[PDB]
């Protein structure tokens with residue numbers, strides 16, 4: 001689809017078999033989701049944003065469907081203000097910026 | 100143009116008579132720029148992201164050119180680690196997300 005930006009580009013995602021709403025975020029290198037349960041192993045990591053750094057759990061090679069498009073990649077879980085889909089997954093679904 | 104997301108979507112902007120690099124950021128409601136001593140009145144504001152909130156100065160009706168596309172709107176100035184062009188201006192230059 002072509003998504004205009006008068007509203008937040010929020011979309012439905014499927015991860016761990018569960019539906020969620022997430023923000024398509026071209027300013028995020030990484031995908032960061034709010035606290036949730038995911039199966040498999042994870043590693044503790046740090047990630048920094050506009051206000052400083054937070055502790056996240058890093059899940060690698062996670063299946064996630066974004067607005068009907070499949071991706072498999074790294075998902076960070078932690079106290080982010082909102083679920084964000086970052087460039088690591090936006091590239092996989094073929095998302096580009098156009099003006 | 101079309102911008103892929105293999106790397107950060109950095110572009111040159113002109114604001115306050117200065118050229119700077121800034122992210123085209125679909126996840127930013129507002130535009131947030133590195134500390135700069137703009138003239139005119141402003142209003143205090145706090146904006147939150149990963150890590151928490153930062154204090155910024157809100158300037159209204161600021162002229163800003165993004166890849167040769169002119170815009171005018173609100174710009175927030177403060178200790179951000181990166182310049183981000185938010186949806187308030189991305190809509191003015193006709194920017195969409197496409198996949």
Ligand SMILES: CCC(CC)CN(C[C@@H](O)[C@H](Cc1ccccc1)NC(=O)O[C@H]1CO[C@H]2OCC[C@H]21)S(=O)(=O)c1ccc(OC)cc1
Pocket residue numbers: 023025026027028029030031032047048049050051080081082084086124126127128129130131146147148149180181183185
């Ligand atoms: C609330 C959603 C999101 C935070 C997630 C908001 N951000 C825009 C993002 O694009 C920032 C913009 C941003 C980019 C880089 C450094 C600071 C901020 N990116 C970001 O935090 O990404 C992190 C996750 O992936 C990593 O790659 C970048 C940092 C990591 S922001 O910078 O904090 C922000 C911008 C405008 C605003 O107006 C009300 C309020 C908050």
